[PDB]
Design an enzyme around this catalytic site. Structure first.
Site, mmCIF file in Angstrom:
data_model
loop_
_atom_site.group_PDB
_atom_site.id
_atom_site.type_symbol
_atom_site.label_atom_id
_atom_site.label_comp_id
_atom_site.label_asym_id
_atom_site.label_seq_id
_atom_site.Cartn_x
_atom_site.Cartn_y
_atom_site.Cartn_z
ATOM 1 N N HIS A 1 14.839 7.738 2.537
ATOM 2 C CA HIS A 1 14.149 7.584 3.810
ATOM 3 C C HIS A 1 14.615 6.335 4.550
ATOM 4 O O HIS A 1 13.870 5.759 5.346
ATOM 5 C CB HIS A 1 12.637 7.579 3.595
ATOM 6 C CG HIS A 1 12.100 8.901 3.137
ATOM 7 N ND1 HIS A 1 10.795 9.079 2.730
ATOM 8 C CD2 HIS A 1 12.696 10.111 3.027
ATOM 9 C CE1 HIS A 1 10.611 10.341 2.384
ATOM 10 N NE2 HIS A 1 11.750 10.988 2.552
ATOM 11 N N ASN B 1 11.061 4.860 -0.744
ATOM 12 C CA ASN B 1 10.572 3.566 -0.297
ATOM 13 C C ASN B 1 11.640 2.823 0.501
ATOM 14 O O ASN B 1 12.839 3.091 0.398
ATOM 15 C CB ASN B 1 10.138 2.719 -1.493
ATOM 16 C CG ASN B 1 9.042 3.380 -2.308
ATOM 17 O OD1 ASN B 1 8.382 4.307 -1.843
ATOM 18 N ND2 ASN B 1 8.850 2.910 -3.534
ATOM 19 N N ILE B 2 11.174 1.876 1.314
ATOM 20 C CA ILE B 2 12.037 0.994 2.082
ATOM 21 C C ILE B 2 11.806 -0.470 1.731
ATOM 22 O O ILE B 2 12.307 -1.357 2.427
ATOM 23 C CB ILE B 2 11.856 1.226 3.596
ATOM 24 C CG1 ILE B 2 10.394 1.020 4.002
ATOM 25 C CG2 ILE B 2 12.308 2.626 3.963
ATOM 26 C CD1 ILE B 2 10.184 0.954 5.505
ATOM 27 N N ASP B 3 11.063 -0.745 0.657
ATOM 28 C CA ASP B 3 10.748 -2.118 0.289
ATOM 29 C C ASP B 3 11.886 -2.816 -0.448
ATOM 30 O O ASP B 3 11.794 -4.023 -0.683
ATOM 31 C CB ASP B 3 9.470 -2.158 -0.563
ATOM 32 C CG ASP B 3 9.556 -1.296 -1.823
ATOM 33 O OD1 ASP B 3 10.607 -1.293 -2.497
ATOM 34 O OD2 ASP B 3 8.547 -0.638 -2.163
ATOM 35 N N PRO C 1 0.837 -1.200 0.000
ATOM 36 C CA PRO C 1 0.000 0.000 0.000
ATOM 37 C C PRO C 1 0.867 1.243 0.000
ATOM 38 O O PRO C 1 2.018 1.220 0.444
ATOM 39 C CB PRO C 1 -0.793 -0.127 1.304
ATOM 40 C CG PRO C 1 0.176 -0.789 2.226
ATOM 41 C CD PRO C 1 0.973 -1.761 1.359
ATOM 42 N N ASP C 2 0.320 2.336 -0.526
ATOM 43 C CA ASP C 2 0.994 3.615 -0.384
ATOM 44 C C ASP C 2 0.519 4.247 0.922
ATOM 45 O O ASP C 2 -0.137 3.602 1.746
ATOM 46 C CB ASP C 2 0.774 4.501 -1.615
ATOM 47 C CG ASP C 2 -0.668 4.979 -1.775
ATOM 48 O OD1 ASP C 2 -1.490 4.808 -0.848
ATOM 49 O OD2 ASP C 2 -0.976 5.541 -2.852
ATOM 50 N N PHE C 3 0.848 5.516 1.130
ATOM 51 C CA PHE C 3 0.528 6.190 2.379
ATOM 52 C C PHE C 3 -0.718 7.060 2.276
ATOM 53 O O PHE C 3 -1.579 7.014 3.160
ATOM 54 C CB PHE C 3 1.721 7.041 2.831
ATOM 55 C CG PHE C 3 2.947 6.239 3.156
ATOM 56 C CD1 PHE C 3 3.170 5.776 4.441
ATOM 57 C CD2 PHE C 3 3.881 5.953 2.178
ATOM 58 C CE1 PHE C 3 4.300 5.037 4.744
ATOM 59 C CE2 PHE C 3 5.013 5.208 2.475
ATOM 60 C CZ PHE C 3 5.220 4.753 3.760
ATOM 61 N N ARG C 4 -0.845 7.845 1.205
ATOM 62 C CA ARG C 4 -1.823 8.925 1.169
ATOM 63 C C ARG C 4 -2.957 8.724 0.172
ATOM 64 O O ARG C 4 -3.815 9.603 0.064
ATOM 65 C CB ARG C 4 -1.111 10.254 0.881
ATOM 66 C CG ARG C 4 -0.186 10.664 2.008
ATOM 67 C CD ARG C 4 0.479 12.004 1.783
ATOM 68 N NE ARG C 4 1.353 12.311 2.909
ATOM 69 C CZ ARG C 4 2.567 11.797 3.090
ATOM 70 N NH1 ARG C 4 3.085 10.949 2.206
ATOM 71 N NH2 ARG C 4 3.267 12.138 4.161
HETATM 72 N N1 LIG Z 1 -0.126 2.249 -9.287
HETATM 73 C C1 LIG Z 1 0.105 3.686 -9.242
HETATM 74 N N2 LIG Z 1 0.439 4.332 -10.344
HETATM 75 C C2 LIG Z 1 0.645 5.635 -10.330
HETATM 76 N N3 LIG Z 1 0.537 6.355 -9.222
HETATM 77 C C3 LIG Z 1 0.213 5.791 -8.079
HETATM 78 C C4 LIG Z 1 -0.023 4.387 -8.053
HETATM 79 N N4 LIG Z 1 -0.347 4.112 -6.683
HETATM 80 C C5 LIG Z 1 -0.282 5.301 -6.041
HETATM 81 N N5 LIG Z 1 0.006 6.131 -6.899
HETATM 82 C C6 LIG Z 1 0.220 7.500 -6.551
HETATM 83 O O1 LIG Z 1 1.553 7.487 -5.856
HETATM 84 C C7 LIG Z 1 1.501 8.569 -4.825
HETATM 85 C C8 LIG Z 1 1.817 8.039 -3.462
HETATM 86 O O2 LIG Z 1 2.127 9.161 -2.642
HETATM 87 P P1 LIG Z 1 2.267 8.778 -1.025
HETATM 88 O O3 LIG Z 1 1.146 7.647 -0.632
HETATM 89 O O4 LIG Z 1 2.295 10.045 -0.286
HETATM 90 O O5 LIG Z 1 3.726 7.982 -0.940
HETATM 91 P P2 LIG Z 1 5.125 8.877 -0.950
HETATM 92 O O6 LIG Z 1 6.190 7.917 -1.284
HETATM 93 O O7 LIG Z 1 4.968 10.214 -1.867
HETATM 94 O O8 LIG Z 1 5.275 9.302 0.655
HETATM 95 C C9 LIG Z 1 6.570 9.766 0.948
HETATM 96 C C10 LIG Z 1 6.786 9.671 2.426
HETATM 97 O O9 LIG Z 1 5.555 10.118 3.138
HETATM 98 C C11 LIG Z 1 5.396 9.165 4.288
HETATM 99 O O10 LIG Z 1 5.320 9.875 5.455
HETATM 100 C C12 LIG Z 1 6.587 8.294 4.265
HETATM 101 O O11 LIG Z 1 7.631 8.890 5.070
HETATM 102 C C13 LIG Z 1 6.997 8.274 2.861
HETATM 103 O O12 LIG Z 1 8.381 7.877 2.720
HETATM 104 C C14 LIG Z 1 0.130 9.125 -4.860
HETATM 105 O O13 LIG Z 1 0.207 10.403 -5.550
HETATM 106 C C15 LIG Z 1 -0.701 8.152 -5.594
HETATM 107 O O14 LIG Z 1 -1.749 8.843 -6.307
HETATM 108 O O1 LIG Z 2 9.289 7.701 6.979
HETATM 109 C C1 LIG Z 2 9.454 6.569 6.177
HETATM 110 C C2 LIG Z 2 8.618 5.429 6.749
HETATM 111 C C3 LIG Z 2 8.739 4.219 5.827
HETATM 112 C C4 LIG Z 2 7.976 3.042 6.422
HETATM 113 N N1 LIG Z 2 6.896 2.469 5.892
HETATM 114 C C5 LIG Z 2 6.526 1.462 6.719
HETATM 115 C C6 LIG Z 2 5.335 0.538 6.512
HETATM 116 C C7 LIG Z 2 5.053 -0.454 7.439
HETATM 117 C C8 LIG Z 2 3.967 -1.289 7.247
HETATM 118 C C9 LIG Z 2 3.162 -1.131 6.131
HETATM 119 CL CL1 LIG Z 2 1.761 -2.206 5.880
HETATM 120 C C10 LIG Z 2 3.445 -0.140 5.206
HETATM 121 C C11 LIG Z 2 4.532 0.696 5.397
HETATM 122 N N2 LIG Z 2 7.376 1.432 7.737
HETATM 123 O O2 LIG Z 2 8.263 2.407 7.542
#
Ligand SMILES: Nc1ncnc2c1ncn2[C@@H]1O[C@H](COP(=O)(O)OP(=O)(O)OC[C@H]2O[C@H](O)[C@H](O)[C@@H]2O)[C@@H](O)[C@H]1O
Ligand SMILES: OCCCc1nc(-c2ccc(Cl)cc2)no1
Ligand SMILES: [Zn+2]
Length: 302
Positions: free
Chosen positions: A134, A115-117, A41-44
């Site tokens: 990160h 990412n950390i994956d 999953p993503d975050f936002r």
């Molecule tokens: N399959 C996809 N294809 C294209 N875009 C996508 C897809 N899935 C998601 N998106 C888009 O991908 C974006 C995901 O944005 P966010 O969920 O914020 O992830 P980050 O890596 O920017 O978060 C960075 C840090 O914030 C945290 O605190 C952690 O510290 C993180 O390290 C969105 O715009 C989605 O619309």
């Molecule tokens: O500031 C960077 C945090 C990165 C981080 N992401 C995760 C994470 C853990 C569990 C699941 Cl389901 C999804 C994401 N842990 O650290």
């Protein structure tokens, strides 16, 4: 001063630029969006993103689970979440292998990932190709600046998968993986690479990130003013009028749509499909599909 490098603000325009002799060095800036097709999953993202699915931890707000001051008061939620993501074995995506193909084409100056994956590494990017901006969960450290005792991953798992909050053996302070939490410094490599890379980048490829955290969001503004910037993302990111509480600094963002747009292109959709479309324009599509096919098979065989 500097000439304009894209002949049109489209994926086709970026492709023609990449095949020219003027595009020599590409920097990729990526976030969690490049791994959602793998099942992470993503975050936002609303509803499906991590930050909309942390009610059970009863946090003051979702980001607290990755904030260092909250962690020091309530470390249990983070470690409970960490074991929720552990069991999955994930494959890199088409998007990851497109960056690997950029490496094999001699075009990849650097991949900066939030990412950390570790899927960039699994796809075949080497340590020198990468800035894991990160952090990483491979190594861990005591949180006391006077101690900073380092602990390996095996030690961290031994505590986690045995239901004990990791405590430092020297000072009894909390021990956490070297994931960068809110309030924590980024790895030194981030800044030494940034200072040199962004003086000699011909193209920024921004994929799967909302550009909602600093200092990573600042990177798009570190490139020369002539450097084209292609976003492949489900949604436009980094483009907005200013507002109180915006993440970007004034003028630090993307301009895809105004009358003054001259170098920024947004391709809206899935990262995998965007990279396939770009590869097709470059004549790389079968090559890319072969790479994914053979590398996924090699992963399964091992
Ligand atoms: N399959 C996809 N294809 C294209 N875009 C996508 C897809 N899935 C998601 N998106 C888009 O991908 C974006 C995901 O944005 P966010 O969920 O914020 O992830 P980050 O890596 O920017 O978060 C960075 C840090 O914030 C945290 O605190 C952690 O510290 C993180 O390290 C969105 O715009 C989605 O619309
Ligand atoms: O500031 C960077 C945090 C990165 C981080 N992401 C995760 C994470 C853990 C569990 C699941 Cl389901 C999804 C994401 N842990 O650290
Ligand atoms: Zn310690």
């Amino acid at each position: 001063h500097m000439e304009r490098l894209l002949d049109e603000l489209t994926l086709e325009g970026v492709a023609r630029y990449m095949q020219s002799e003027r595009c020599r060095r590409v920097i990729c800036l990526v976030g969690a969006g490049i791994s959602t097709s793998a099942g992470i999953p993503d975050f936002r993202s609303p509803s499906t993103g991590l930050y909309d699915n942390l009610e059970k931890y009863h946090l003051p707000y979702p980001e607290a689970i990755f904030e260092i001051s909250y962690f020091k008061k309530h470390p249990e939620p983070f470690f409970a979440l960490a074991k929720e993501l552990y069991p999955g074995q994930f494959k890199p995506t088409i998007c990851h292998y497109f960056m690997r193909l950029l490496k094999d084409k001699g075009l990849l100056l650097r991949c900066y990932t939030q990412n950390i994956d570790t899927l960039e590494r699994i796809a075949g990017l080497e340590q020198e190709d990468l800035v894991e901006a990160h952090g990483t969960f491979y190594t861990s450290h005591c949180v006391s600046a006077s101690c900073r005792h380092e602990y390996p991953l095996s030690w961290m798992k031994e505590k986690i998968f045995s239901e004990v909050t990791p405590k430092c053996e020297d000072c009894q302070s909390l021990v956490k993986p070297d994931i960068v939490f809110f309030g924590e410094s980024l790895p030194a490599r981030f800044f030494s690479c940034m200072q040199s890379d962004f003086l000699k980048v011909d193209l920024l490829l921004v994929m799967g990130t909302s550009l909602q955290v600093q200092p990573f969001a600042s990177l798009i503004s570190k490139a020369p003013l002539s450097t084209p910037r292609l976003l492949i993302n489900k949604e436009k990111a980094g483009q907005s009028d200013p507002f109180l509480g915006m993440i970007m600094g004034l003028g630090g963002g993307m301009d895809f749509d105004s009358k003054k747009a001259y170098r920024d292109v947004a391709w809206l959709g899935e990262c995998d499909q965007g990279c396939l479309a770009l590869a097709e324009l470059l004549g790389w599509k079968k090559e890319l599909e072969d790479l994914v096919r053979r590398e996924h098979a090699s992963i399964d065989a091992q």
